Every structure is written in C-alpha cells, then in structure tokens.
C-alpha cells in the first residue's frame, strides 16, 4: 500500500486501488475484460495495482516501440518478477538481463529457418497420425473435442522436435503422463503477499511438481536437443508448455472460426487444393506459398493472442515519449485490448481474414498487432509455431471439413481464469471429404 498514490502523483488515471489488494478484485471479469474496460474509460495510458505492484498500461504505438524495441536492453529488459520459481529462474522467459542474453543467444540458432526446414519432414509425420486418429472419431459420427486430438498432436510434435521421442500420445495415453502432467487460488495470495515468495522459495516447493523434473534429466540421455547441467532442462520445460498448450489452443480457436465461417473454410481448402494438389504432402516451401492460410492464422491470433499482455519491468527512472516512468513499475502492453480496439480495426469483434490481405496488411501497425511480442524479447518460437500449426491445418483440411454441433458453444466464450482458452472446449462435427 506504499505505491497506491503513485499514479495519482504522476497524473495517471486509473481504477482506485484498495489497500493490500490493489485492483485485483477488478479481475473478476477476467484479465482481458479488465484491460478493455480500463482502455475504454481511461484512454491511452492508465495505471493500476496488482496487490502492491504498480502496473502502467500503454497503448500508443510509438511508446510501445520505445519499450519493446528501442529501450529494451537499457530499461525494459525483463518481465515482472514472479513468485516461487526455484531453478526455473534459468528459463529463457524468466532469466533477466545477463543469462537471458546468454540463453537467448545459445538458443536463437535452434529456431533458425534452417532447422525448421530440417524439422518439417519430421513433424509432418504426426500430421498423418493426426489424420488417422481424426478419421477414427470421424467415422463414429460423434462430435470431436479438438483439444484432445490437437493436444495429442502438439504433444507428439514437441516431444519429437525437442528430444526425438516418437510417441502416439492419443493412442498411447501412457513421457505421455509426465508432460500431460499439467486456477488462480494461491497465485492471488502470492500477489497480495509477495513477501511470502522467499519463504516459498526456501522450502524447495516450486510451483511445478519437481519430480517429473528429475524424470526429465533421468530421460535426458547422453531436434532441439541435438542442436545443443540442470538449466539445460529448464529451457526444454518452457518449450513443452509452448509446443503443447499454446499450439493446441490456437489450433482450437482457428478451427472454431473455420467451422463458424464456412465460406472462409471453403476458400482456405480451395487454396490448399490449388497448392499441394491431390492431398499431396505439405513441405516447407509449400506452406509459405499459402496466402489465405497466413491470413486465417493471423486473424485468429488477432482475436485470441494467448499471451493477452506484454510486460516489461522499468529498471531505472526514465522518461519516454514525454512521460516519466519510475523505476520498478511494470509497463504493460494490453495486446488483447489493442487487437480489439476500433481505433485500429474496423468491426474488431468480426472474424475477417481479409484484414490481412496483401492490400490491407500495409495499413496495420506492428506495435498495435503483437501476437508474438516484439523487439529483442519477442517469441523465439514464432516461426516454428506458425509452421507447426499451418502443417496441422493443411493436412486436416485436406481430408476433413468442420461444422458446428448442437454441442458447439456459439458464440464461443473465453474462459474466466487466467489462460486464453475457450470456456467450453470446442466441439465440432467432422466430415470426411472423401
């Protein structure tokens, strides 16, 4: 409660904080809705408090660019300090200043266009497993829970790309467990009581069950791995989360959009049959040829950017684009709110892949649309992820069409907790094109 006057003092509007809690009660509508309501009432810049942590929200593209790009190494180097992290402090997305640079450099080649082309033949093999497992639930006629099949796929791909362990997760429900081993109760407390984090740290009770962590090095025998003692595995733990949840979630969002916009699904499928003809197998070169696929993926990432917020800690008193940022304030770029802002988007709530057509993509600001972040600390896996999703999308759409059920939640609702994911799992009728 020592900072609660900070935004008053700076002239920065925002919701009035409560002692100890700050504004965290406002989150009862979800992170994303809080951000949108705040943008609506307060304007371009506002401040609020996560417990006692002042957070400054910025929506001006120039200032976003200054924060993510220009003044990154100097001022905005790290994300918000989190609670019990333990050895996971060595994670590339957790490391701060030095060590990060090291990890980042030590890993940037592992995500070069070169390795991806080398991995495209590999991950394509789980597309077929996916098609067959799809054709199984399809022939039954019963609705399909996309998260389950896509999850199995995503898990299959990340395990092979990161270790070479080739498994059929959906058909081998038993590495499968260990990874599958995965709301906001203690977390809230850790926010209001950040002073208990060091206690939690010394008890060796990090957030993860750190018993599969032994399993990982116990399974690190001596792909992402061959492209390289305990910190080594800490990076791969981050890769699995990315490769599994975010990928499968985004895949479910896209299929939801495709099933609810048949014309879009048909056009995409026409693009996939023009390219890649006769259910031909997708390659690295072929994917980068499919323009409408890129627009569909991009639109969906506009509607549903699974990171929701971009965040950087101000390391020193600075003044950027005419406003003073005191040391220690977290600067938040509310990507979700920005993706749905009518200032930058006509009918922001409408799915409209044409926004991203070669004509219209120009009039789109790269600091307003930030599905993968920006500047030095952006998503190192963006290319890998897009390819992985596109490859999935192509093979599935080469063989199946997707339709709403009685069971499908329309309009989809977002989950109320702290992850960008559907309220109800996406469930769709799947019909074979043959």
334 vs 359: CA distance, rounded Å: 27
Task: Please tell me the distance from the alpha carbon of residue 247 to that of residue 272, in angstroms, as a whole number.
Answer: 21
- Is 379 labeled as ligand-binding? yes
Least distance to ligand HEM, CB of residue 348, Å: 18
Query: Which of these ranges, 212-220, 239-247, 257-265, 267-275, lies near ligand HEM under the rule CB under 6 A?
Result: 239-247
Distance of CA 432 to the CA centre of its chain: 30
Q: How far is the CB of 146 from ligand HEM (least distance, A)?
A: 15
125 or 378: whose CB is closer to ligand HEM? Answer: 378
Task: Please check whether residue 287 is in contact with residue 387, taking contact to mean a CB–CB distance below 8 angstroms.
Answer: yes
Considering only CA atoms, which of 225, 240, 234, 221 is closest in space to residue 179? 240
Q: Is 150 in the site for ligand HEM (CB under 6 A)?
A: no
Partner in contact with 201, chosen from a second copy, ligand HEM, none, beta carbon below 5 to 8 Å by kind: a second copy
Is 157 a residue that touches ligand HEM (CB under 6 A)? no
We find the least distance from the C-beta atom of residue 385 to a second copy, in angstroms, to be 34
Residue 371 has a CB neighbour count (10 Å cut-off) of 23
> What span, in angstroms and rounded, lies between the C-alpha atoms of 324 and 63?
12
Minimum Å gap between C-beta 377 and a second copy is 22
Is 4 one of the binding residues for ligand HEM (CB under 6 A)? Answer: no
What are the residues facing 191 on neighbouring strands?
none
Judged by beta carbon distances under 5 to 8 A according to partner kind, the member of a second copy, ligand HEM, none in contact with residue 85 is: none
Pick the closest to residue 392 from 146, 137, 112 (CA basis): 146
Applying CB under 8 A, the residues found at the interface with a second copy are 194-195, 198-199, 201-202
Give the one entry of ligand HEM, a second copy, none that residue 306 binds, where binding means its C-beta sits below a cut-off of 5 to 8 angstroms depending on kind: ligand HEM
Among 238, 258, 296, 430, binds ligand HEM (CB under 6 A): 238
Give the nearest residue (CB) to ligand HEM: 373
Q: Which entry of ligand HEM, a second copy, none binds 337, CB below 5 to 8 A by partner kind?
A: none
Kindly state the tokens that stand for 167.
């498994």
**Contact of residue 377 among a second copy, ligand HEM, none (CB under 5-8 Å per partner type):** ligand HEM
Binding of ligand HEM by 367 (CB under 6 A): no
Whole-number minimum distance, CB 22 to a second copy, in Å? 14
- What residues does 333 pair with on adjacent strands? 310
Residue 250 site contact among a second copy, ligand HEM, none (CB < 5 to 8 Å, cut-off depends on kind): ligand HEM
CB of 159 to ligand HEM, least distance (A): 12
Report what 59 binds from a second copy, ligand HEM, none; CB cut-off 5-8 Å by kind: none
Do residues 170 and 135 make contact, with C-beta atoms less than 8 angstroms apart?
Answer: no
CB of 158 to ligand HEM, least distance (A): 7
| Residue showing tokens 């993968």 | 372
CB-nearer residue toward a second copy: 1 or 140: 1
Closest CA to 280 of 206, 391, 430, 203: 391
Burial class (CB in 10 A: 0-12, 13-18, 19+), 31: buried
Binding site partner of 325, from a second copy, ligand HEM, none, Cβ cut-off 5-8 A by kind: none
Neighbours of 64 (CB within 10 A): 24
The count of residues interacting with ligand HEM (CB under 6 A) is: 25
How far out from the chain centre does Cα 402 lie?
24
**What is the CB-side half-sphere exposure of residue 433 using CA atoms within 13 A?**
16
Site string for ligand HEM, 102-121 (x = CB under 6 A): --x-----------------
Instruction: Give the HSE-up count for residue 152: Cα atoms under 13 Å, Cβ half-sphere.
Output: 21
Q: How many CA atoms lie within 13 A of 305 on its CB side?
A: 24
Report, in Å, the least distance between residue 391 CB and ligand HEM: 13
Plot region of 160 (φ>0 → left; ψ -120 to 50 → alpha; else → beta):
alpha
Alpha-carbon distances of 387 from 16, 78, 134, 248, 425, rounded to whole Å: 44, 28, 20, 13, 24
Are 161 and 153 spatial neighbours (Cβ–Cβ below 8 Å)?
no
Site for ligand HEM in 306-365 (CB under 6 A): 306-307, 310
**What does 131 interact with, of ligand HEM, a second copy, none (CB < 5 to 8 A by kind)?**
none
89 binds ligand HEM (CB under 6 A): no
Residues that bind ligand HEM (CB under 6 A): 68, 92-93, 104, 238-239, 242-243, 246-247, 250, 306-307, 310, 371-374, 377-381, 384-385
Q: Annotated binding site for heme: which residue ranges?
A: 379
Binding residues: 379
């Amino acid at each position: 409660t020592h900072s609660h006057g900070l935004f008053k003092k700076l002239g920065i509007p925002g919701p009035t904080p409560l002692p100890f809690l700050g504004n965290i009660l406002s989150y009862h509508k979800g992170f994303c809705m809080f951000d949108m309501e705040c943008h609506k009432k307060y304007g371009k810049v506002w401040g609020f408090y996560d417990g006692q942590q002042p957070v400054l929200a910025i929506t001006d593209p120039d200032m976003i660019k200054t924060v993510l790009v220009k003044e990154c190494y100097s001022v905005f180097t790290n994300r918000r300090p989190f609670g019990p992290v333990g050895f996971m402090k060595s994670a590339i997305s957790i490391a701060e200043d030095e060590e990060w640079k090291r990890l980042r450099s030590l890993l940037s080649p592992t995500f070069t266009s070169g390795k991806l082309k080398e991995m495209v033949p590999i991950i394509a093999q789980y597309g077929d497993v996916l098609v067959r497992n799809l054709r199984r639930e399809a022939e039954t006629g019963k609705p399909v829970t996309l998260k389950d099949v896509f999850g199995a796929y995503s898990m299959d791909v990340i395990t092979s790309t990161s270790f070479g362990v080739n498994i059929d997760s959906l058909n081998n429900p038993q590495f499968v467990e260990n990874t599958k081993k995965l709301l906001d109760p203690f977390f809230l407390s850790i926010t209001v009581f950040p002073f208990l984090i060091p206690i939690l740290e010394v008890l060796n009770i990090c957030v993860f069950p750190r018993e599969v962590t032994n399993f990982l090095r116990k399974s690190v025998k001596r792909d992402f791995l061959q492209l390289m003692d305990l910190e080594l595995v800490a990076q791969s733990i981050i890769f699995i989360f990315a490769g599994y949840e975010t990928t499968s979630s985004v895949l479910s969002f896209i299929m939801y959009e495709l099933a609810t916009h048949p014309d879009v699904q048909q056009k995409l499928q026409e693009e996939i049959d023009a390219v890649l003809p006769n259910k031909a197998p997708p390659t690295y070169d072929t994917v980068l040829q499919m323009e409408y696929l890129d627009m569909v993926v991009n639109e969906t990432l506009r509607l549903f950017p699974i990171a929701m917020r971009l965040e950087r800690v101000c390391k020193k008193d600075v003044e950027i684009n005419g406003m003073f940022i005191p040391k220690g304030v977290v600067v938040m770029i509310p990507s979700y709110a920005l993706h749905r802002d009518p200032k930058y988007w006509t009918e922001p709530e409408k799915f409209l892949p044409e926004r991203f057509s070669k004509k219209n993509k120009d009039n789109i600001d790269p600091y307003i649309y930030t599905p993968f972040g920006s500047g030095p600390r952006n998503c190192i896996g963006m290319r890998f992820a897009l390819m992985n999703m596109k490859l999935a999308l192509i093979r599935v759409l080469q063989n199946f069409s997707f339709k709403p059920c009685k069971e499908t939640q329309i309009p989809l609702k977002l989950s109320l907790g702290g992850l960008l994911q559907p309220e109800k799992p996406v469930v769709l009728k799947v019909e074979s094109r043959d």
